[PDB]
Amino acid sequence: LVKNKCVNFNFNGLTGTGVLTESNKKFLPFQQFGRDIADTTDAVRDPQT
Amino acid sequence: LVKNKCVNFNFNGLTGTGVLTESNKKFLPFQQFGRDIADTTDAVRDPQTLEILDITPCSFGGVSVITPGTNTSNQVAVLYQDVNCTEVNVFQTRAGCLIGAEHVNNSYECDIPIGAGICASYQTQSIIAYTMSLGAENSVAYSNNSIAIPTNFTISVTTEI
Amino acid sequence: LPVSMTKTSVDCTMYICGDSTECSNLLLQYGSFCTQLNRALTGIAVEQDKNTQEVFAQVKQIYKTPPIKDFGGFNFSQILPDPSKPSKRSPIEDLLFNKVNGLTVLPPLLTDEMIAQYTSALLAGTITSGWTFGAGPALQIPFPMQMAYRFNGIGVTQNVLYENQKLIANQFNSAIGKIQDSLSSTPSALGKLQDVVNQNAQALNTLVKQLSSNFGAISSVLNDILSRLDPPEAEVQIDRLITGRLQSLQTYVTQQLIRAAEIRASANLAATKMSECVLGQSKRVDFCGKGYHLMSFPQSAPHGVVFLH
Amino acid sequence: SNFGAISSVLNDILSRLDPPEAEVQIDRLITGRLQSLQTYVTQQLIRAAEIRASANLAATKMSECVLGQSKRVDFCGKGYHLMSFPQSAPHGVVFLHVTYVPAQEKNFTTAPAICHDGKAHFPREGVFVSNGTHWFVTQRNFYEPQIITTDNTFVSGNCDVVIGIVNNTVYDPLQPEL
Amino acid sequence: LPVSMTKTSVDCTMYICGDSTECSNLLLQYGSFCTQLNRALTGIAVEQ
Amino acid sequence: STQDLFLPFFSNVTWFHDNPVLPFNDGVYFASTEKSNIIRGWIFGTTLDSKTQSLLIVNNATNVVIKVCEFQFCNDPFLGVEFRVYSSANNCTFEYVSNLREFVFKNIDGYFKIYSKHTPINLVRDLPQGFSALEPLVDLPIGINITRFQTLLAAAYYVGYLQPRTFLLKYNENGTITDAVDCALDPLSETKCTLKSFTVEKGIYQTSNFRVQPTESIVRFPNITNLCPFGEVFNATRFASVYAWNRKRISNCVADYSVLYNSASFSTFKCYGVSPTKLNDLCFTNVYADSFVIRGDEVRQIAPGQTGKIADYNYKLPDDFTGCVIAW
Ligand SMILES: *[C@@H]1O[C@H](CO)[C@@H](O)[C@H](O)[C@H]1NC(C)=O
Ligand SMILES: *[C@@H]1O[C@H](CO)[C@@H](O)[C@H](O)[C@H]1NC(C)=O
Ligand SMILES: *[C@@H]1O[C@H](CO)[C@@H](O)[C@H](O)[C@H]1NC(C)=O
Ligand SMILES: *[C@@H]1O[C@H](CO)[C@@H](O)[C@H](O)[C@H]1NC(C)=O
Ligand SMILES: *[C@@H]1O[C@H](CO)[C@@H](O)[C@H](O)[C@H]1NC(C)=O
Ligand SMILES: *[C@@H]1O[C@H](CO)[C@@H](O)[C@H](O)[C@H]1NC(C)=O
Ligand SMILES: *[C@@H]1O[C@H](CO)[C@@H](O)[C@H](O)[C@H]1NC(C)=O
Ligand SMILES: *[C@@H]1O[C@H](CO)[C@@H](O)[C@H](O)[C@H]1NC(C)=O
């Protein structure tokens, strides 16, 4: 996993680009990823950690 | 043949949805069917019984939900936009068929706009409606000699934004 | 000045598609124009009834004129409402009314009689209170003095008025009548209003008239197009027909907006005018009528207003 | 929305459609999207001009109800205007309109002039009022009754024309002293 | 202050179809578009 | 806001307390209100007759098992307060091992999504007037056509049926659902969806469009005149020889071929390129008819591709003639 850098990614299928930071957010155990209120991907969970 | 109903039709050349009725138009005999100023089929002569039929499209309109703030009550009223209620308590108005509303004679200041001076509010205990108040009347005593001069005053402040 | 305009409203589909799901099913692929289109007219509709309130509901509390109309010698009987008419209207405006398929037409929020009825009270406060009511609790001042103040407002000492009251009176009463026939005489008097409705009719009738062209497609009755053509090939035919029909409507809407704003520009102007010229006496020379200004007299009209400076 | 195209993504349609056939497919998104963009402009532009008209109003209004005292009734809000106070808000301005409004009054009876020495009088700035017995003249927007003098009024014409001018006295400051 | 813009006029067709009867005869399939377009321009000009 | 499959609010749900087969309308809702836990099984499939794929489940205290086989379903399967709900376990397709319990099922896109939520037993004689959400538990990838289901025990519960509606879901501050609203329940509610807001301020709001549908079709026509003179072609008394075949042009008139359907006088009633039923309802330039007499065995020759003496030397038709022919 590479952080704080402009990279391309795919987490279990979640395609896209950007930069990854440790989100302060809190998911729920079953969920996989959050989205923008305006429907844009906002966060993911690394299966690694 | 069918009259007075929202029906799908064709009179030998021309389709269209509509509600027909026996008009009083007298065409010239050679002619079958009548058209309005804006180039639209407005009449057809039923070629069996050569009546003059008036085409009127199926009465329709928008729907807007009468409501006080949900904050107040879950009980609502509904407006169906300008159809004769028979075509749909009920209190008909010039602004349409307004179900869930009870008219009231007493003049009341407008609260919610509907149309044709029709406004409503919660009461005590359901939703009412009424021809709206013109505003509160306040006649003033004119004379050729009566003068009214103020004595105290207030410095209001308002917020034009 | 025009004040409002016909609150037209056209649905998305029932214009483009006369309830032919095939046409609808194709239409949904153009995304959300019509909602955007439809919303635009909606605002136009709302802005209209907003206009009239912004120009007439300048008075919180209604007034009435007294029974006995002794006004130092001023015959406003031409402008006050008359009981004799069943519409409770006034003779002047009575002349004014005399002198003047996929869509919908909303009625105005305000009923025309109330439109008159604000004018009714508007006169009274102007008549039997002077400017004071425009600013708060109305105060009744015998009308001859109210002139004097306005004369005092034009660098014209109060002496002149009472000195010449009768001649001052008779001129005003004499003046009044000349309006009545002047409107009756000139066939192009109310053209400003007369154009507006005439323009909008030309718009809508244009809008419907467009509904009968072919736009690079086989014909302009989609049902026959639905019949005479197989769907998949008809879609391309329909597509062309949808395009022209659509942006033809688009033109209509853009046409509407700019006109509406122009009205709004006119509207506020009237409201500003009906504040400054009516609710008080201005000093903007050649704004409240040519020559030094005295007062005003609003008068209701179809979709519009008339002032008497 | 793909404006009637096969696919809604320019990348896929380049692949998932043959290139020469793509162009006609490509055209649709162009015409579709382009017009969709364009309508946004016209939508914006009209709204912008609307704002500018509004802006000028305030632009005038501040330079009217702040940098001065606009006599225009209702232009600085309800009532006679005293001062306005700007405060900045996101994208727009708010206007505290410090306005003046009379509150409470009483009935009074008026006569539009006074004749004292066979000679007419007009109030220089007041208006003649009656507490029933003693007449008074006062500024015309606050009950501040004041005594009849020569100094407070003036004179023009005699008492044969004015309607309802009322027989009454007028004082002279000079005479009691001399 | 500006007062009036240059009175501008453009034909329905002469612009779109620079005098080709084959063109306009194909255009008249388009309803009363252009006639409206002239109106606004004419409306602008008289306005000016 | 999402539109998906749900149990609509204020539905009217079946209550049990003897567990017959119950179908699956579009979704499966189930929830058992009992601390006895006796009800701990489900049956799935369409035939449920050991001949089709099926799904099985047993909710043991600590040994949770899920099965996808063609069990020889006991027609009256149960257990005791003895786990044999079937008679044989052959051709198995899949296996898995894992106070108020709600279980929502759907066999969607070939997948089987099973959702759960456990809440205490705090009710007495009604399904609680409370609210919560269902949390997904397991999605199973099993390609089964499922029509009905049955619950398996050794109490009471409720079962309704999911529906395709549209909802708004107030996702909370931390990714849970604290409330939701039906779009299509009531006027007030339908306001929220279009406003996409959970709480409406006081006023008026256009919501939808009220349109009247066409209740019936109709079409009318002039009294049908000028029937084409057909009797003098069929019922005609005398006919000519075949090389002297007469051509009777048919002018402007109405055909009404309805008689030639429902009159078996002629033996063939044979049409070429056009179905008989789809030609009594057509329009053309005009019609030409050949009325004559040929042999009893000249029946086949009246067609394209026939090239006999009658065809070639007495009366020929084009290889692509569009019409009909009758020989009796
Ligand atoms: C709205 O609801 C709030 C409760 O949060 C209440 O305090 C307020 O008075 C309500 N207002 C109206 C107009 O219902
Ligand atoms: C509605 O129906 C009534 C039935 O008597 C009829 O009198 C009335 O004219 C109808 N409404 C309109 C607008 O015609
Ligand atoms: C109002 O009064 C009229 C006159 O009697 C009557 O017809 C109508 O029903 C009354 N309505 C109400 C709400 O009282
Ligand atoms: C003045 O007198 C009239 C008639 O008695 C009365 O209607 C009016 O209310 C009075 N004004 C005040 C301020 O009391
Ligand atoms: C005011 O009108 C009354 C009505 O009779 C009249 O008697 C009175 O004289 C008038 N006022 C004056 C100042 O004349
Ligand atoms: C439930 O169904 C019964 C009978 O079918 C009926 O009496 C009852 O009104 C229904 N309840 C609701 C909320 O519709
Ligand atoms: C917020 O997150 C915490 C854990 O970080 C969780 O316990 C809590 O339930 C969440 N808030 C809500 C309203 O669910
Ligand atoms: C059509 O037939 C009807 C049957 O009653 C008859 O009354 C009518 O006069 C006829 N009209 C024509 C034009 O044939």
Author numbering:
A (entry chain C): 533 to 581
B (entry chain A): 533 to 620, 641 to 676, 690 to 726
C (entry chain B): 727 to 826, 856 to 1064
D (entry chain A): 968 to 1145
E (entry chain C): 727 to 774
F (entry chain A): 50 to 66, 80 to 143, 156 to 172, 188 to 243, 263 to 436
Quote the original article.
Many efforts to develop therapies against severe acute respiratory syndrome coronavirus 2 (SARS-CoV-2) are focused on the interaction between the spike protein, which decorates the surface of the virus, and its host receptor, human angiotensin-converting enzyme 2 (hACE2). Linsky et al. describe a de novo design strategy that allowed them to engineer decoy proteins that bind to the spike protein by replicating the hACE2 interface. To address these challenges, we have developed a computational protein design strategy that enables the rapid and accurate design of hyperstable de novo protein “decoys” that replicate the protein receptor interface to which a virus binds to infect a cell. The S protein RBD attaches to the cell by binding to hACE2, a membrane-associated protein, triggering protease-mediated fusion with the cell membrane.
CTC-445 is a 160–amino acid protein comprising 18 of the natural amino acids; it does not contain cysteine or tryptophan residues. The computationally derived model of CTC-445.2 closely matched the cryo-EM–determined structure [Cα root mean square deviation (RMSD) = 1.1 Å], with minor differences observed in the N-terminal EE3 and H2 helix. As designed, the binding interface of the SARS-CoV-2 RBD with CTC-445.2 closely mirrored the target hACE2 interface. We used site saturation mutagenesis (SSM) to explore the effect of single–amino acid substitutions in CTC-445.2 on its binding to the SARS-CoV-2 RBD. The experiment showed that mutations in the core of the design are disallowed, and mutations in surface or exposed residues are generally tolerated. The SSM experiment also revealed that there is room to further improve the affinity of the protein by introducing mutations in the binding interface, although doing so would break the hACE2 structural mirroring of the de novo decoy. We also performed an SSM experiment for the SARS-CoV-2 RBD binding interface to compare the effect of single–amino acid substitution on binding to hACE2 or CTC-445.2. Although CTC-445.2 was resilient to viral mutations in the RBD-binding interface, we observed some decoy-binding–weakening mutations that had a lesser effect on hACE2 binding. Therefore, viral mutational escape might still be possible if multiple (decoy-binding–weakening) RBD mutations are combined.
